[PDB]
Amino acid sequence: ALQLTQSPSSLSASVGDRITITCRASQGVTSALAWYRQKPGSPPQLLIYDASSLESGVPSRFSGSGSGTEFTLTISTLRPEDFATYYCQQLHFYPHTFGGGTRVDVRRTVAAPSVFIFPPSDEQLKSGTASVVCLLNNFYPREAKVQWKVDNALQSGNSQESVTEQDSKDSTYSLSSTLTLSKADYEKHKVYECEVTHQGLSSPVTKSFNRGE
Amino acid sequence: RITLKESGPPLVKPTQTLTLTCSFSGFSLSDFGVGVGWIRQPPGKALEWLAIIYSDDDKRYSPSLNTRLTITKDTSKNQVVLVMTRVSPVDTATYFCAHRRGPGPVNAMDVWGQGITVTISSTSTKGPSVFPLAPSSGGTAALGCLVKDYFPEPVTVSWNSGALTSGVHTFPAVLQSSGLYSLSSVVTVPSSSLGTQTYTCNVNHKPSNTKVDKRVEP
Numbered sequence: 001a002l003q004l005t006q007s008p009s010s011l012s013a014s015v016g017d018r019i020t021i022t023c024r025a026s027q028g029v030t031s032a033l034a035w036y037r038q039k040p041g042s043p044p045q046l047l048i049y050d051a052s053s054l055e056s057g058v059p060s061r062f063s064g065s066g067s068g069t070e071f072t073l074t075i076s077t078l079r080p081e082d083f084a085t086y087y088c089q090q091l092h093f094y095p096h097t098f099g100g101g102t103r104v105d106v107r108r109t110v111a112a113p114s115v116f117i118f119p120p121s122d123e124q125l126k127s128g129t130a131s132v133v134c135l136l137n138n139f140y141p142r143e144a145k146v147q148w149k150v151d152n153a154l155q156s157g158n159s160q161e162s163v164t165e166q167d168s169k170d171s172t173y174s175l176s177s178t179l180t181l182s183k184a185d186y187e188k189h190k191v192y193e194c195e196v197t198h199q200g201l202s203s204p205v206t207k208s209f210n211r212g213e
Numbered sequence: 214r215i216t217l218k219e220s221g222p223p224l225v226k227p228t229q230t231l232t233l234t235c236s237f238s239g240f241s242l243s244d245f246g247v248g249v250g251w252i253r254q255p256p257g258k259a260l261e262w263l264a265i266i267y268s269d270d271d272k273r274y275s276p277s278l279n280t281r282l283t284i285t286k287d288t289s290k291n292q293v294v295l296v297m298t299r300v301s302p303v304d305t306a307t308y309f310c311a312h313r314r315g316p317g318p319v320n321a322m323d324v325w326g327q328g329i330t331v332t333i334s335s336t337s338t339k340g341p342s343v344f345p346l347a348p349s350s351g352g353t354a355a356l357g358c359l360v361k362d363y364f365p366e367p368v369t370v371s372w373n374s375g376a377l378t379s380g381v382h383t384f385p386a387v388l389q390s391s392g393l394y395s396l397s398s399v400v401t402v403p404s405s406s407l408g409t410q411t412y413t414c415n416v417n418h419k420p421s422n423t424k425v426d427k428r429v430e431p
Contacts, residue, residue: 001276034321043309043328044252044260049321087260091313091320094273096250098260114401116355118346124359133346135355135399137382162384162396174382176397178359180389 002027004090006099012107012141013078020074021102023088028068032092035064035073038101039084040165047086048073078104083166105142108171112200113139117193117207120186130186132179134194134207138172145197146177147204151189155179186211215239217249217310217326224365227335227392231297235310235326242286242293243268246315249286249293250322255306256385265313266293305333305388336364336392340423343416346399349431354407356429357399358414362391363421370398371415407431 003026013019023033031051036044046055048064051071061082064073075082083106088099113136120130136144142163148155161177177194193208221233235249242249250265264274264284274282283296293310307330311322341363348356360368370383377400386396398414413428 032320038260043311043325044322045325046321046323049323050317051320053318055321055323089260089262089322095275096262096265098252098262101259114353114355116348118357121344121347121359124342124344124361127342131344131359131361131395133357133359133397135346135357135397137355137399137401160387160389160395162387164382164384174384174399176382176384176399178387178395178397 001095002029002090002093002097004088004097004099006086006088006102008102009100010103010105010142012105014107015078015080017078018074018076019078019104020072021086023071023073023099025069025071025090027093029090029092031067032090033066033071034089034091035062036087036089037082037084038087039081044087105166106171108140110200111138111140111172113137113144113175113196113198115194115196115205115207117209119192119209119211125183125186128183130181130183132181132192134177134179134196136175136177136196136198138167138170138174139198139200140172141199142166142173143199144175146175147195147197148177148179149191149193149195150181150185151191215312215324217312217324219308219310219326219329221329221331223330223332225300225331225333227301227333229300231300231304231331231333233295233297233308233310233329233331235293235295237291237293237310237312240312241288241291242266243288244315246319248313250311250313251284251295252309252311252322253304253306254309254328255303258306263308264295300333302333302388302390302392305331307331332365332388334364334388334392338421339364339393340418340421341368341416341425343414343425343427345427345429346397347429347431348407352403352405353401354404355399355401356412357397358416358427358429359395359397360386360416361395362389362393363395363418363423364393365420366394368394368396368416368418370396372398372400373411373413374415377412
């Protein structure tokens with residue numbers, strides 16, 4: 001199947017910056033490529049069509065170029081409303097595939113996360129399940145790694161996490177990861193560890209607690 | 214002045230069939246080369262092309278979903294319908310229908326509908342259970358509430374009846390394999406205030422007429 005690869009997948013920039021994003025197709029698609037901007041909670045919005053045509057009503061900031069397998073989207077002077085996700089789409093070969101997208105966020109100084117670990121409540125244990133949560137508060141950049149351990153055992157497949165939208169005043173992100181275990185598993189072990197990796201940490205930090213102590 | 218709007222049930226069972234309708238105006242699917250397509254987007258991912266239909270009644274589908282998708286059009290009512298069979302939780306996403314100009318401007322989907330959110334779960338309307346996430350010169354301690362096992366979205370969380378807003382982070386919910394949602398809401402506060410100030414999250418799940426006030430402390 002034809003593949004459309006967007007680079008970079010993620011990009012941090014500032015208002016007034018000039019950025020150019022790319023979309024490459026595994027096979028020639030002539031000029032059948034469109035670029036869209038998508039603000040969270042809204043549908044995609046056409047910016048450029050036919051590879052280089054500026055859609056009517058779209059600000060002069062945007063421009064596109066390319067043909068065959070190479071395509072670019074450039075924004076002259078990034079505006080606050082440009083912090084969003086952009087997608088490219090090829091309509092030369094069916095199915096009309098979309099790229100994986102490129103996330104453009106507000107750049108700010110690197111900030112390590114404040115990490116907190118929370119044991120499950122006695123109230124919840126009665127239900128037969130134990131939820132242990134790890135909070136990574138106000139960090140930047142967005143990329144972060146959370147590793148769960150129970151008595152030195154790496155946990156895999158039993159956790160879920162969610163991240164907040166970039167803070168409008170802080171430009172930071174926060175992340176919550178929950179490790180789910182049966183009440184039995186929880187009572188059977190003692191040390192619960194949340195290990196976090198992030199550019200702002202010279203080394204990974206581990207927050208933990210002992211079910212007993 | 215082209216407009217399109219998606220409609221259909223926002224909830225569908227893990228084996229049932231999903232039926233969506235796209236109502237449009239400002240153009241006719243009888244014109245030349247005009248098309249109406251469907252694009253989906255799971256909350257955690259990119260856009261995925263589903264299918265498109267043209268005036269010729271010609272249709273094209275995602276190869277991978279070809280045996281699960283059926284798209285039709287009704288000239289008389291200006292509507293396009295998409296039928297997705299054997300849905301599963303992985304199909305929960307926002308579905309958009311869009312317009313494609315006829316034969317240039319044909320190389321894009323110029324106008325999009327607002328999109329409709331479709332959740333795939335075999336779950337019944339259930340209120341949440343609210344658990345505490347207890348905290349413990351220096352300052353800033355974190356505390357919060359775990360709002361677990363509710364359905365369907367959404368739920369609202371406030372702190373101290375809205376008196377506390379600074380430092381609050383309410384995370385988007387995650388749909389668990391159980392088909393029930395779970396989200397957490399936290400707030401950072403000065404460690405020194407733990408001994409005096411009181412903190413309680415106000416949870417409200419309208420769908421189930423469930424309101425819970427959860428006092429949280431060390």
